[PDB]
Amino acid sequence: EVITSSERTTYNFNVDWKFIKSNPKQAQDINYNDATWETISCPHTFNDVDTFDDLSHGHHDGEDNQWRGTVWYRKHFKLPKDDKGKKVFIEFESVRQIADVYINGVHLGQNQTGFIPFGFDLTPHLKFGEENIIAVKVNNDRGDHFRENFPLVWNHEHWHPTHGGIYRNVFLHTMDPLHITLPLYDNLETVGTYVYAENISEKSADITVETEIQNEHAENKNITLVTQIVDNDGAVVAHSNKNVAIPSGQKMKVTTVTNIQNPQLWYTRYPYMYKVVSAIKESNKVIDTYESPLGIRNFDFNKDSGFWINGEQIKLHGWGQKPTNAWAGLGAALPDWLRDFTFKLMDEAGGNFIRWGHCAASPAEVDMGDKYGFVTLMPGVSGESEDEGETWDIRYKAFKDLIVYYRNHPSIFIWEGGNWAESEAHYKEILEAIKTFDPKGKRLMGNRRADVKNDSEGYVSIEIGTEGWEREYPDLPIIESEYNREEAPRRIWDKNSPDDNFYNHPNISKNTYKLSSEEFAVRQADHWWNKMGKKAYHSGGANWIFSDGPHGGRCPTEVTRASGEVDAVRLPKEAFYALKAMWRPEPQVHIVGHWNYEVGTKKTMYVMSNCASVKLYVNDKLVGTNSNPENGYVFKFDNVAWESGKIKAEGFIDDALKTTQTKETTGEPAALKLTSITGPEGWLADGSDVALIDVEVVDAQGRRCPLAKGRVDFTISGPAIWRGGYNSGKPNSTNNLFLDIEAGINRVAVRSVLESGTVTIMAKKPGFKDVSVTLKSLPIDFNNGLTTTLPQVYTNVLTKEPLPEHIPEMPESELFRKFSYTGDGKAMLRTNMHWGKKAYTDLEYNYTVLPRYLNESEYVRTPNSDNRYWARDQLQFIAGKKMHIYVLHDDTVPRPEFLLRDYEDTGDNVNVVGASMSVFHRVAEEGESIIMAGNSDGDAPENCRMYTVMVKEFK
Numbered sequence: 001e002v003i004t005s006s007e008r009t010t011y012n013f014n015v016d017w018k019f020i021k022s023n024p025k026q027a028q029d030i031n032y033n034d035a036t037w038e039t040i041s042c043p044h045t046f047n048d049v050d051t052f053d054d055l056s057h058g059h060h061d062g063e064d065n066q067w068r069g070t071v072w073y074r075k076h077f078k079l080p081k082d083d084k085g086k087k088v089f090i091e092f093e094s095v096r097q098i099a100d101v102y103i104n105g106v107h108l109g110q111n112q113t114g115f116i117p118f119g120f121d122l123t124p125h126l127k128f129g130e131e132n133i134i135a136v137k138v139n140n141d142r143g144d145h146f147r148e149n150f151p152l153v154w155n156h157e158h159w160h161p162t163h164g165g166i167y168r169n170v171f172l173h174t175m176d177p178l179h180i181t182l183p184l185y186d187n188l189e190t191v192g193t194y195v196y197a198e199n200i201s202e203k204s205a206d207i208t209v210e211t212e213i214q215n216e217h218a219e220n221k222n223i224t225l226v227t228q229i230v231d232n233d234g235a236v237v238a239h240s241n242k243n244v245a246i247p248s249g250q251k252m253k254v255t256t257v258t259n260i261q262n263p264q265l266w267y268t269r270y271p272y273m274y275k276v277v278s279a280i281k282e283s284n285k286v287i288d289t290y291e292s293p294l295g296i297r298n299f300d301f302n303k304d305s306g307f308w309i310n311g312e313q314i315k316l317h318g319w320g321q322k323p324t325n326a327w328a329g330l331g332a333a334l335p336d337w338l339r340d341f342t343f344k345l346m347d348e349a350g351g352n353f354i355r356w357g358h359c360a361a362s363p364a365e366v367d368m369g370d371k372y373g374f375v376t377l378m379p380g381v382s383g384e385s386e387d388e389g390e391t392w393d394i395r396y397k398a399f400k401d402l403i404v405y406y407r408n409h410p411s412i413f414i415w416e417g418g419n420w421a422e423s424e425a426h427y428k429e430i431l432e433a434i435k436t437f438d439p440k441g442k443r444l445m446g447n448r449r450a451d452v453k454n455d456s457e458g459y460v461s462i463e464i465g466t467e468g469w470e471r472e473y474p475d476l477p478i479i480e481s482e483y484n485r486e487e488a489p490r491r492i493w494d495k496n497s498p499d500d501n502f503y504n505h506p507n508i509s510k511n512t513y514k515l516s517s518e519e520f521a522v523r524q525a526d527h528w529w530n531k532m533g534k535k536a537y538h539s540g541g542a543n544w545i546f547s548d549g550p551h552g553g554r555c556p557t558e559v560t561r562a563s564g565e566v567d568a569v570r571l572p573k574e575a576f577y578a579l580k581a582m583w584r585p586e587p588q589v590h591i592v593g594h595w596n597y598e599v600g601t602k603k604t605m606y607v608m609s610n611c612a613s614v615k616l617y618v619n620d621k622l623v624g625t626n627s628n629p630e631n632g633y634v635f636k637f638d639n640v641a642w643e644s645g646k647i648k649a650e651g652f653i654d655d656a657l658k659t660t661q662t663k664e665t666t667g668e669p670a671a672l673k674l675t676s677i678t679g680p681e682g683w684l685a686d687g688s689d690v691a692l693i694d695v696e697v698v699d700a701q702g703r704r705c706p707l708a709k710g711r712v713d714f715t716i717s718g719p720a721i722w723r724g725g726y727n728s729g730k731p732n733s734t735n736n737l738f739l740d741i742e743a744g745i746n747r748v749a750v751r752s753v754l755e756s757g758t759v760t761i762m763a764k765k766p767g768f769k770d771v772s773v774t775l776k777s778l779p780i781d782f783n784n785g786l787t788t789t790l791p792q793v794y795t796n797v798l799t800k801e802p803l804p805e806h807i808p809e810m811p812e813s814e815l816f817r818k819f820s821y822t823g824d825g826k827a828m829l830r831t832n833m834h835w836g837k838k839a840y841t842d843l844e845y846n847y848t849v850l851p852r853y854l855n856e857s858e859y860v861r862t863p864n865s866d867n868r869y870w871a872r873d874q875l876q877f878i879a880g881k882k883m884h885i886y887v888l889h890d891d892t893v894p895r896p897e898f899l900l901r902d903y904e905d906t907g908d909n910v911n912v913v914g915a916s917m918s919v920f921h922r923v924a925e926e927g928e929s930i931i932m933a934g935n936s937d938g939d940a941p942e943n944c945r946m947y948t949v950m951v952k953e954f955k
């Protein structure tokens with residue numbers, strides 16, 4: 001009963017391209033000789049070999065020591081002379097950053113979005129029955145300074161590592177001249193289908209589908225449009241038909257309304273997915289088919305009680321992940337199944353929310369949101385700025401392309417209008433774009449840092465919060481977009497374990513964060529509980545960064561911003577199991593760390609648990625019972641005496657045993673262990689599929705040694721391309737046929753080639769027997785440059801999960817408008833400045849002598865601990881009245897850019913216990929947006945003073 005076959009064929013266009021990392025003249029020409037170019041397959045990036053190999057700069061400056069410029073791709077392919085009268089479209093999921101596409105030497109156009117799909121009609125230039133050639137000229141250049149990088153201001157490693165090339169999938173679509181259109185607004189100006197659900201209950205739901213159809217034949221067509229609703233088992237549950245005439249050359253939208261009896265609704269704990277099959281028929285003959293996703297759900301982001309879905313209230317907890325999503329050794333060009341692997345890990349740790357930061361996810365990643373039940377906050381392209389001119393035009397156009405592409409996915413609940421407040425006129429345009437292309441989705445709209453412009457009031461539909469600060473729009477629901485900025489490397493367990501190039505790292509004193517995995521894990525509850533978890537009005541939100549990546553960070557001991565709860569090769573940190581124990585709905589306990597300590601060790605043991613009480617045992621001797629968890633989920637046990645053997649925690653709800661975890665002391669190292677991980681279809685010989693290999697050091701019992709480290713050397717043979725892994729704490733650790741073990745394990749990637757065959761990887765380590773794994777890359781159905789086999793992903797992932805069995809108990813200035821501070825320390829607003837008042841929140845230093853104009857001013861007691869911290873939005877407020885702004889800045893600190901841009905030097909100084917602070921003066925009008933960043937732009941003296949702010953009404 002399900003309509004399957006038609007004139008439409010979707011080809012995978014990833015396999016077998018020619019590539020060159022340069023800009024040769026006439027590279028788009030039909031008869032350009034590309035024989036010496038490199039044979040690759042998409043997804044592909046030429047920055048896989050020169051990223052994750054530079055130690056972080058800190059100061060939120062991302063990795064810039066990588067190749068940037070103009071490169072070229074060329075692909076040969078032949079369509080059957082059979083298809084001689086078919087439309088042919090090419091679709092690019094994304095190209096980074098500027099793409100120019102050519103077909104047989106004819107330029108089709110450019111796309112500068114870097115992260116949004118686009119496509120072109122090849123038909124007028126195709127030679128059927130002959131070889132055709134696509135050429136893609138790609139540029140990934142960007143201006144050095146993230147504030148002077150126009151127009152593509154989102155294109156900067158500050159937020160988005162500039163990994164260039166065709167880093168997502170490419171498809172070829174062939175179809176009848178009479179066809180449903182493709183949702184690639186750039187540059188086809190078509191929108192495909194629009195699916196929305198109304199009058200939803202458990203009993204009934206009405207699905208409206210508007211199908212845009214185009215008749216590119218020279219004669220009118222009388223057609224029947226069929227809308228089929230297909231459930232999770234592939235059964236047709238309901239259908240609708242409409243008989244319409246499409247005049248020759250015309251586009252029209254055909255609407256159907258189809259009722260579903262007893263719909264399976266879409267929940268975060270049961271993301272039931274329907275599919276809509278749209279078919280064009282010409283009397284029993286099927287001309288075209290197109291499939292659209294369908295998840296049926298009612299929802300409410302409520303200002304008082306958080307988020308509801310289908311009448312159940314659900315706390316949202318998940319991650320903010322970079323769209324680059326890069327994998328060490330591979331860059332941003334993840335095969336879809338590695339994107340699925342990343343997503344399955346978020347799902348494993350209880351995620352039900354995702355924000356892409358700060359450009360759109362790939363298409364398959366929105367499919368993964370759909371099938372794992374992730375409420376999604378989706379941006380188009382953005383950096384961190386109110387934009388204008390051409391920057392706004394390109395970004396706004398990308399926003400339309402984005403809605404046209406993604407509007408039918410049920411995982412999307414909020415359109416992120418931007419990663420900064422915007423002008424009133426631009427808010428109008430944002431709502432007008434949603435009204436044009438998504439009038440019926442009931443999605444909300446917000447911008448992060450909307451609170452820094454009065455423009456946002458009355459336009460944003462949901463407060464997009466930062467770092468769990470107090471709500472600034474109590475009329476609205478609130479969702480957290482980026483909380484917990486901390487970093488910590490996977491390889492450091494705790495201060496009771498031997499150091500692994502961290503506490504003694506040459507760069508350790510430049511780190512903002514010097515946390516072990518245990519501290520990083522345990523504090524996950526501090527951050528979550530106090531910023532979202534304990535607030536019944538708070539919908540929840542996104543933990544900043546899921547996987548380590550070389551975007552801007554604060555720890556030059558690492559080659560990434562180490563803020564993920566898994567590392568850049570998706571090895572989980574203890575913090576991953578902390579969040580998993582807090583956020584999963586079933587009862588959980590997780591003992592933080594390991595059980596290989598020295599004889600006589602005494603340490604605090606942390607159990608993370610969503611249970612009500614936890615019991616702790618050392619070799620079956622009960623050492624404690626805790627019914628008073630800290631921050632909802634931390635059951636700690638002080639001064640536990642280590643004993644070789646076994647440590648076991650028990651989790652209880654209502655004094656009934658729910659779950660148990662045991663960790664064991666490992667024995668001495670005894671062998672290397674190699675374990676392979678491939679995609680669900682196996683390792684495919686397509687030139688880009690990846691096989692992962694876990695290399696471990698194990699004891700005689702086969703348990704991973706948590707303290708093992710040291711260099712392993714590798715050899716590879718067979719048709720494959722070694723891509724290595726990384727060591728977070730070391731430069732130039734990528735590519736090499738050797739790698740250090742960290743806490744007993746590391747992970748390398750092997751990429752296939754077009755030739756299928758047997759591939760052998762051997763690992764060696766002094767003192768161990770050699771070990772090996774044998775892989776087989778499997779042949780794919782490939783011919784004339786084309787395959788109908790789509791990129792492999794995990795299928796049939798639908799299961800039902802229960803609601804949590806236990807949730808921890810929850811508790812009971814006219815000038816500094818919308819003040820907020822995002823440094824690690826605490827700021828404090830205070831009034832009536834004069835001699836004797838404290839200058840900082842974390843010191844007892846007082847102001848003594850003051851220039852006359854400073855007295856009676858309102859002031860911000862800043863935390864001196866943030867004296868070398870940097871954040872774009874460190875300190876902000878809207879000027880409540882016309883006022884004087886004074887910034888006291890340590891003379892020993894290089895003046896930061898925001899100070900020199902908008903503040904003049906007074907000549908006067910204010911001495912505060914030996915430190916001379918120059919006053920900088922600024923007059924602000926009422927409503928002016930006052931944004932302050934780090935004390936210094938780069939390095940500074942370790943013992944310098946954090947700056948302070950003073951404010952007085954103009955009068």
Ligand SMILES: [Br-]
Pocket residue numbers: 161322324325326548549550551
């Ligand atoms: Br990244």
Ligand SMILES: [Mg+2]
Pocket residue numbers: 484543544545546563564565
């Ligand atoms: Mg994180």
